[PDB]
């Protein structure tokens with residue numbers, strides 16, 4: 001009912017994976033491990049940053065968890081405009097929604113963007129996810145040729161890395 | 165006769181030049197509002213928001229105007245919470261008169277070695293549907309072709325950042 005928003009620490013990684021998997025579940029599997037998450041976020045070069053919502057013992061989940069929400073983000077670069085904050089995952093446990101946790105994470109995300117001089121914050125939302133679409137729209141969000149996403153998988157990267 | 169190397173801060177005027185030539189190629193040169201000063205700050209300060217590789221030619225092959233940089237790639241890392249680290253190819257461009265000589269292939273070898281060193285599972289990138297030469301260029305190297313994007317601008321972010 002009351003809560004604190006703070007940067008994640010390494011000891012939060014198990015809760016982060018649990019919430020990544022709960023958001024995946026809401027959108028739809030997840031093959032990332034706690035160890036990856038730990039190395040990728042808290043090693044020498046962080047590949048993502050996380051804000052976490054923490055509730056007092058009074059309001060811990062039935063399973064005993066203090067962390068009831070999170071956001072995962074990273075920076076991207078638009079070579080026409082400049083740096084962007086990219087919001088990757090954003091989720092509050094179903095029983096703690098509607099009490100301002102979300103809005104507080106978004107204020108903290110907003111602060112990061114201004115500190116870091118991002119012109120905009122970018123994020124994906126599913127078509128069917130109507131409550132989230134309206135929630136974002138209320139806060140200023142607009143929606144954005146025809147350019148296709150391509151990927152080259154590690155087996156082909158390996159081939160090119162190791163040909164001369 | 166060419167070397168692929170990491171960009172240095174002194175290469176920023178060339179990077180902007182090639183950013184603009186790629187946007188022209190993509191029918192969108194008028195969108196480029198980035199400056200050389202932004203590139204320098206964003207690329208060559210405390211926190212780089214992109215990385216760049218450049219193709220430099222020797223004196224005997226400099227462009228008619230005298231430039232030694234004839235190609236580049238701009239990249240950054242993103243994070244897929246289901247999978248882990250990804251290498252995201254933002255811009256990839258070789259000046260027309262210097263295409264067909266192995267430069268793009270060699271840039272792609274260097275990108276693939278970044279992905280391997282960094283343990284990225286895949287390299288992701290956008291390709292316009294009209295851009296047939298490049299589509300086939302990438303498909304011959306293993307590329308596979310494979311939800312609404314919202315933004316919140318600076319003024320709305322500042323708004324959320326500064327409220328109780």
Ligand SMILES: CC(=O)SCCNC(=O)CCNC(=O)[C@H](O)C(C)(C)COP(=O)(O)OP(=O)(O)OC[C@H]1O[C@@H](n2cnc3c(N)ncnc32)[C@H](O)[C@@H]1OP(=O)(O)O
Pocket residue numbers: 023026087088089090091092093096097098099100101102103104123124125129132134135138
């Ligand atoms: C992942 C991405 O990058 S995009 C996808 C975003 N994530 C999701 O959709 C996952 C499911 N949803 C959620 O986890 C959350 O609802 C979030 C993250 C979207 C928002 O977090 P919350 O803590 O619920 O936000 P907060 O409490 O500040 O406000 C939510 C708003 O919805 C309303 N609301 C939320 N729950 C309820 C409810 N059960 N009944 C009535 N109204 C509700 C609130 O009144 C509030 O309204 P406002 O827009 O007028 O301020």
Ligand SMILES: CC(=O)SCCNC(=O)CCNC(=O)[C@H](O)C(C)(C)COP(=O)(O)OP(=O)(O)OC[C@H]1O[C@@H](n2cnc3c(N)ncnc32)[C@H](O)[C@@H]1OP(=O)(O)O
Pocket residue numbers: 186189253254255256257258259262263264265266267268269270289290291295298300301304
């Ligand atoms: C972010 C993005 O991905 S945006 C889209 C990419 N950019 C564009 O479309 C802009 C126009 N394109 C460019 O400027 C590009 O970098 C490209 C895509 C044209 C590639 O750069 P290039 O230097 O032309 O590539 P490179 O010269 O290595 O290879 C092109 C072809 O010539 C052949 N080739 C080049 N050099 C040699 C050589 N020395 N011996 C034999 N064959 C050669 C290659 O095999 C390749 O053909 P393939 O597809 O059959 O293998």
Ligand SMILES: [Ca+2]
Pocket residue numbers: 088089090245
């Ligand atoms: Ca996500």
Ligand SMILES: [Ca+2]
Pocket residue numbers: 115116117211
């Ligand atoms: Ca910053």
Ligand SMILES: [Ca+2]
Pocket residue numbers: 174175176177178
């Ligand atoms: Ca220069």
Ligand SMILES: [Ca+2]
Pocket residue numbers: 079254255256
């Ligand atoms: Ca681009």
Ligand SMILES: [Ca+2]
Pocket residue numbers: 045281282283
């Ligand atoms: Ca690395």
